């Protein structure tokens, strides 16, 4: 079964097993093997794996990792993917002294927006966008990966799982407990990542949900009914929240130009109905000169 693959090294680890770099012994193809442990007298195939595999089968796009095969045995389930040099978190960590060159930051965001807009157009919410879930290759591509929290959404949406998105990249409508969330939560995550690529550190590194909210409030201003109608009636909103004023983006993301500032603030708009969509983000003037530089690996 796994006869034909030779495990080469551990690339990461998760929830259901391990993630290995492996090679096909017959063709030489280098792959990433993601092991999902099953058993029996348990729950059968994990609902996160059933979604990951069926959502990935419908997401054929240059900016979305490619699922190559699914080896569904009686004991284990293996997801077989194309192998990319590394995740964006490792590339960021290796570039903390230099920083990521401006043109490559813009190229990475444009490609992240094109894979995200393809997801949304195929009625799929990602819901776990962070640097370690994004994959880069040696030629300048970047791809969405880790579809382990994703879900097919409906028009109009219903209520979905409340515990979604890694804390630092979580949208404020989730943190405030809104009954409904949708595609704007992935946009928020991408705004966070764009900033992080720019400044070289997490934009909102909270250490708990109230702390995460307060970091957002201190940078963008504590929202009120004028900036986000309905805010003060949200389930976890408290009228005793400190009221901080918005900080000028020249302090927030100093290296970013006017066009980049404009795009970042539309990705971080409080009100999800006004936050920019991935598709409109693709037409912002920040991308008029976009190119495809190769990373310095």
């Amino acid at each position: 079964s796994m006869e034909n693959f030779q495990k080469v090294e551990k690339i990461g680890e998760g929830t259901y097993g391990v993630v290995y770099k492996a090679r096909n012994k017959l063709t030489g193809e280098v792959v990433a093997l993601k092991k999902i442990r099953l058993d029996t007298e348990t729950e059968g195939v994990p609902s996160t794996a059933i979604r990951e595999i069926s959502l990935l089968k419908e997401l054929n796009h240059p900016n979305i990792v490619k699922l190559l095969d699914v080896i569904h045995t009686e004991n284990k389930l293996y997801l077989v993917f194309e192998f990319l040099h590394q995740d964006l978190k490792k590339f960021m960590d290796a570039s903390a002294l230099t920083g990521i060159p401006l043109p490559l930051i813009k190229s990475y965001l444009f490609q992240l927006l094109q894979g995200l807009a393809f997801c949304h157009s195929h009625r799929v919410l990602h819901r776990d966008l962070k640097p370690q879930n994004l994959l880069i290759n040696t030629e300048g591509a970047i791809k969405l990966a880790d579809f382990g929290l994703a879900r097919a959404f409906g028009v109009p949406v219903r209520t979905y799982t409340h515990e979604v998105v890694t804390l630092w990249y979580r949208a404020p409508e989730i943190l405030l407990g809104c009954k409904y969330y949708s595609t704007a939560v992935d946009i928020w995550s991408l705004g966070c990542i764009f900033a992080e690529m720019v400044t070289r550190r997490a934009l909102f590194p909270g250490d708990s949900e109230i702390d995460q909210l307060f970091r957002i409030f201190r940078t963008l201003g504590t929202p009120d009914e004028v900036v986000w109608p309905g805010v003060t009636s949200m389930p976890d909103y408290k009228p005793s929240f400190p009221k901080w004023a918005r900080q000028d983006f020249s302090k927030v993301v100093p290296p970013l130009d006017e066009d980049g500032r404009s795009l970042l603030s539309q990705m971080l708009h409080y009100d999800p109905n006004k936050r920019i969509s991935a598709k409109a983000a693709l037409a912002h003037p920040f991308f008029q000169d976009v190119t495809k530089p190769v990373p310095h690996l």
């Binding site: 962070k130 382990g148 929290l149 890694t166």
Partner: peptide, 7 residues
Amino acid sequence: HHASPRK
């Protein structure tokens, strides 16, 4: 850093 939220 935090782990991805878990079903």
